[PDB]
Design an enzyme around this catalytic site. Sequence first.
Site, PDB file in Angstrom:
ATOM      1  N   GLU A  35       0.842  -1.239   0.000  1.00 49.77           N
ATOM      2  CA  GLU A  35       0.000   0.000   0.000  1.00 49.77           C
ATOM      3  C   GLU A  35       0.869   1.278   0.000  1.00 49.77           C
ATOM      4  O   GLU A  35       0.511   2.206  -0.767  1.00 49.77           O
ATOM      5  CB  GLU A  35      -0.982   0.027   1.181  1.00 49.77           C
ATOM      6  CG  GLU A  35      -2.182  -0.916   1.043  1.00 49.77           C
ATOM      7  CD  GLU A  35      -3.164  -0.585  -0.086  1.00 49.77           C
ATOM      8  OE1 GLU A  35      -3.163   0.565  -0.534  1.00 49.77           O
ATOM      9  OE2 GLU A  35      -3.923  -1.482  -0.535  1.00 49.77           O
ATOM     10  N   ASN A  46      -7.024   9.437  -6.303  1.00 53.77           N
ATOM     11  CA  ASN A  46      -7.902   8.543  -7.115  1.00 53.77           C
ATOM     12  C   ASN A  46      -8.603   9.406  -8.181  1.00 53.77           C
ATOM     13  O   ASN A  46      -8.661  10.633  -7.975  1.00 53.77           O
ATOM     14  CB  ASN A  46      -8.877   7.783  -6.211  1.00 53.77           C
ATOM     15  CG  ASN A  46      -8.184   7.010  -5.106  1.00 53.77           C
ATOM     16  OD1 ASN A  46      -7.270   6.247  -5.369  1.00 53.77           O
ATOM     17  ND2 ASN A  46      -8.587   7.202  -3.864  1.00 53.77           N
ATOM     18  N   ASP A  48     -11.837   9.671  -9.048  1.00 53.37           N
ATOM     19  CA  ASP A  48     -13.133  10.269  -8.618  1.00 53.37           C
ATOM     20  C   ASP A  48     -12.911  11.530  -7.764  1.00 53.37           C
ATOM     21  O   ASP A  48     -13.912  12.147  -7.402  1.00 53.37           O
ATOM     22  CB  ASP A  48     -14.001   9.264  -7.856  1.00 53.37           C
ATOM     23  CG  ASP A  48     -13.394   8.730  -6.563  1.00 53.37           C
ATOM     24  OD1 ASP A  48     -12.160   8.848  -6.382  1.00 53.37           O
ATOM     25  OD2 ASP A  48     -14.169   8.202  -5.751  1.00 53.37           O
ATOM     26  N   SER A  50     -11.294  11.705  -4.610  1.00 47.11           N
ATOM     27  CA  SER A  50     -10.834  11.263  -3.261  1.00 47.11           C
ATOM     28  C   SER A  50      -9.312  10.994  -3.255  1.00 47.11           C
ATOM     29  O   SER A  50      -8.724  10.954  -4.358  1.00 47.11           O
ATOM     30  CB  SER A  50     -11.635  10.065  -2.761  1.00 47.11           C
ATOM     31  OG  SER A  50     -11.327   8.856  -3.454  1.00 47.11           O
ATOM     32  N   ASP A  52      -6.106   8.564  -0.994  1.00 46.02           N
ATOM     33  CA  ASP A  52      -5.658   7.545   0.002  1.00 46.02           C
ATOM     34  C   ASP A  52      -4.520   8.131   0.867  1.00 46.02           C
ATOM     35  O   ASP A  52      -3.592   8.731   0.310  1.00 46.02           O
ATOM     36  CB  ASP A  52      -5.290   6.228  -0.696  1.00 46.02           C
ATOM     37  CG  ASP A  52      -6.401   5.569  -1.523  1.00 46.02           C
ATOM     38  OD1 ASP A  52      -7.611   5.801  -1.264  1.00 46.02           O
ATOM     39  OD2 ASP A  52      -6.053   4.818  -2.441  1.00 46.02           O
ATOM     40  N   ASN A  59      -9.069   5.745   2.605  1.00 45.02           N
ATOM     41  CA  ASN A  59      -9.696   6.586   1.548  1.00 45.02           C
ATOM     42  C   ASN A  59     -10.547   7.696   2.211  1.00 45.02           C
ATOM     43  O   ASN A  59     -11.297   7.398   3.156  1.00 45.02           O
ATOM     44  CB  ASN A  59     -10.441   5.684   0.559  1.00 45.02           C
ATOM     45  CG  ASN A  59     -11.051   6.431  -0.610  1.00 45.02           C
ATOM     46  OD1 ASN A  59     -11.493   7.568  -0.468  1.00 45.02           O
ATOM     47  ND2 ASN A  59     -11.129   5.790  -1.762  1.00 45.02           N
TER      48      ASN A  59
END
Length: 128
Positions: A35, A46, A48, A50, A52, A59
């Site tokens: 990760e 990301n 859309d 958002s 991480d 998220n």
Amino acid sequence: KVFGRCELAAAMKRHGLDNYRGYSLGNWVCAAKFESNFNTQATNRNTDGSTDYGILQINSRWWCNDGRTPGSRNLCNIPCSALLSSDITASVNCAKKIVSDGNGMNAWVAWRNRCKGTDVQAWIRGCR
Ligand SMILES: C[C@@H](O)CN1CCN(CC(=O)O)CCN(CC(=O)O)CCN(CC(=O)O)CC1
Ligand SMILES: C[C@@H](O)CN1CCN(CC(=O)O)CCN(CC(=O)O)CCN(CC(=O)O)CC1
Ligand SMILES: [Cl-]
Ligand SMILES: [Cl-]
Ligand SMILES: [Cl-]
Ligand SMILES: [Gd]
Ligand code: NA
């Protein structure tokens, strides 16, 4: 902070993550490696809109507030920035909520594609 492998296992194990919802300590260290590369300060955008955050890349769509993900939820009631700390407490309590919610550790795409069905105990081999 970039954690060593043993150092991150000993912190995750002190914060109760070891066999949490049946997931052994090697599953959590495995996930963190793929990760974030063990780096608490890691961030990824990301498509859309958002982002991480932190060692388990949690998220901002559902779990924390960064003030730039419109009509999103903050179910861990924390700023996104809290998940970037050298202290992994915020991240661990936040991941206990996520893995309890019906889908287990499949919430982590790198866990699903690189740790599920492998020898995960290899990730804590040698540590005291
Ligand atoms: C403990 C040693 O492994 C230290 N190490 C010596 C060099 N190794 C040789 C080898 O890994 O047998 C090759 C490179 N290595 C590949 C890999 O790790 O799979 C990536 C870098 N590593 C990362 C790590 O191992 O944490 C740090 C340096
Ligand atoms: C050259 C060796 O480094 C081969 N190595 C196998 C043995 N490793 C070595 C070790 O780290 O002592 C121990 C297990 N290892 C833990 C970890 O490294 O984080 C996970 C598997 N690795 C993944 C990777 O390297 O990214 C496969 C390659
Ligand atoms: Cl394990
Ligand atoms: Cl927001
Ligand atoms: Cl499960
Ligand atoms: Gd390795
Ligand atoms: Na949010």
